[PDB]
Design a binder for this molecule. Sequence first.
Ligand SMILES: *[C@@H]1O[C@H](CO)[C@@H](O[C@@H]2O[C@H](CO)[C@@H](O)[C@H](O)[C@H]2NC(C)=O)[C@H](O)[C@H]1NC(C)=O
Lengths: 49, 50
Amino acid sequence: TAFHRDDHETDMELKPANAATRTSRGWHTTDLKYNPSRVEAFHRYGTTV
Amino acid sequence: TVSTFIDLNITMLEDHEFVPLEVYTRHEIKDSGLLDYTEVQRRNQLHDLR
Ligand SMILES: *[C@@H]1O[C@H](CO)[C@@H](O[C@@H]2O[C@H](CO)[C@@H](O)[C@H](O)[C@H]2NC(C)=O)[C@H](O)[C@H]1NC(C)=O
């Protein structure tokens, strides 16, 4: 089981995929990846869905 | 009138045109493969920009 940005569960708006040539339609919800904020000399895990 | 001649009937062989004919075109042959590798690649390399 996995969460987005290690955050609570949320229903998100399905956004049309950005334009491309010779491709069928698509839809996503998140445009960017999540990476943890910085604390020095540590391992930190960041989840995107 | 009676005739001393002997008949002979010659008609020229008529013209005939040959139209181009193909059982399978090369596009059907390219489509024969269940997976055209190139098209799969082009589709799958658009995921980040899409
Ligand atoms: C000389 O040429 C042909 C025979 O080789 C005959 O011409 C055809 O005759 C048929 C009937 O047998 C007709 O339906 C056609 O209209 C005729 N023309 C063609 C181009 O086929 C012709 O009759 C022969 N001459 C004589 C006196 O019989």
